[PDB]
Design an enzyme around this catalytic site. Structure first.
Site, PDB file in Angstrom:
ATOM      1  N   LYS A 139       0.836  -1.201   0.000  1.00  0.00           N
ATOM      2  CA  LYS A 139       0.000   0.000   0.000  1.00  0.00           C
ATOM      3  C   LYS A 139       0.881   1.265   0.000  1.00  0.00           C
ATOM      4  O   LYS A 139       1.822   1.383   0.789  1.00  0.00           O
ATOM      5  CB  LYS A 139      -0.955  -0.045   1.189  1.00  0.00           C
ATOM      6  CG  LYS A 139      -1.701   1.261   1.462  1.00  0.00           C
ATOM      7  CD  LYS A 139      -2.737   1.159   2.575  1.00  0.00           C
ATOM      8  CE  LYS A 139      -3.968   0.412   2.149  1.00  0.00           C
ATOM      9  NZ  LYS A 139      -5.014   0.393   3.218  1.00  0.00           N
TER      10      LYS A 139
HETATM   11 CL    CL Z   1      -5.527   3.348   4.007  1.00  0.00          CL
END
Ligand code: CL
Length: 352
Positions: A139
């Site tokens: 991420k």
């Molecule tokens: Cl997030």
């Protein structure tokens, strides 16, 4: 009831759990949820701060790691990577059953790297290798540097969860960077069919920012309207001939992921965001309490594409009122980075 999760799947949306902890996995709870309609897991530094502070199963791991010559960051990473790897193994059957299209677990890079594309790439490659599982996503915040990094990571064959998106313009820039990375691999004769990217487009924070100074007709409407318009952008981008040429060769579309879908204002029904954003080829990551509410009294209907005309009219009125949603988005992204860095620092202090 719980069959609502399979009804949502049938409508083409994945429900992911927006939480992770050592006990969630070790207890067998995550495995059971993967058999019963939850398809993936997201984390971020705030989620890990709360997990580390609240879950008794970390205490012995911390004590062990404090015996070693490790930085606080490495103590954190050892903990977090172990949780992610274990969660990946729980989710692997689901992942394999869809040809690697579902069953992902996300781990975010350090917030202090957010404006450093090189550093981001280096950490993302390292964390991908450390987790050592095909169903892990790294991420990365969707800053300009983040989108630079995205292109490189996609060209490396790494699956990515691009986060802290609040802007349709920045989301489109991310799609174009993804497409460049994919095209690079295709031209090099490299595989792309297992590379998966989600664009985590935040919901409740938009309403939280705006509602107190909006007229009542617009309160609680802006975030959903923005999402609806983002999904129309998505349909247009990915069906265009340029992307279709890539998809014909095996490229996957990016998918929109609705994040921050817990309701934060008690004036709104607690299932508002999940109920309102269901459409094909999307993800919604939901916190535990919102998953509970949705199972109890949510509704599974293809709502995301309904009433787009009214979404656009409302976004026109938002602009008429002087709210620049691009300015707002940048501010929200910067505030979200600050908050994640705060959370991260708070997590690290007990690990010194
Ligand atoms: Cl997030």
């Amino acid at each position: 009831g719980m069959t609502i999760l399979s009804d949502v799947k049938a409508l083409g949306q994945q429900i992911w759990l927006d939480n992770l902890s050592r006990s969630l996995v070790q207890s067998g709870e995550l495995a059971q949820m993967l058999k019963q309609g939850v398809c993936g897991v997201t984390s971020n530094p705030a989620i890990f701060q709360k997990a580390f502070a609240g879950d008794a199963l970390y205490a012995d791991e911390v004590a062990a790691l404090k015996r070693q010559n490790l930085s606080p960051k490495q103590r954190y990473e050892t903990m977090a990577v172990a949780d992610v790897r274990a969660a990946c193994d729980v989710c692997l059957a689901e992942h394999e059953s869809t040809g690697g299209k579902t069953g992902f677990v996300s781990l975010e890079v350090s917030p202090e790297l957010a404006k450093d594309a090189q550093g981001t790439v280096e950490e993302a490659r390292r964390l991908h290798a450390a987790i050592a599982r095909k169903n892990a996503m790294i991420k990365v915040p969707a800053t300009d540097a983040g989108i630079d990094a995205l292109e490189t990571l996609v060209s490396d064959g790494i699956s990515v969860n691009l986060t802290l998106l609040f802007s349709r313009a920045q989301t489109l820039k991310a799609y174009a960077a993804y497409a460049r990375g994919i095209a690079k691999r295709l031209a090099a004769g490299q595989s792309v069919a297992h590379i998966q990217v989600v664009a985590s487009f935040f919901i409740s924070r938009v309403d939280s920012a705006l509602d107190a100074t909006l007229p009542d007709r617009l309160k609680g409407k802006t975030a959903i309207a923005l999402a609806k318009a983002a999904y129309q952008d998505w349909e247009q981008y990915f069906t265009a001939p340029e992307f279709a040429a890539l998809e014909a060769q095996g490229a996957n579309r990016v998918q929109l992921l609705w994040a921050s879908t817990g309701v934060k204002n008690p004036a709104y029904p607690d299932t508002l965001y999940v109920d309102s954003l269901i459409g094909v080829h999307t993800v919604n990551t939901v916190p535990d309490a919102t998953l509970k509410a949705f199972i109890d009294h949510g509704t599974a209907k293809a709502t995301l594409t309904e009433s787009a005309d009214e979404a656009r009219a409302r976004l026109a009125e938002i602009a008429a009122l002087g709210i620049d949603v691009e300015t707002l988005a940048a501010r929200l992204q910067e505030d979200g980075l600050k908050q994640f860095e705060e959370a991260f620092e708070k997590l690290l202090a007990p690990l010194v």
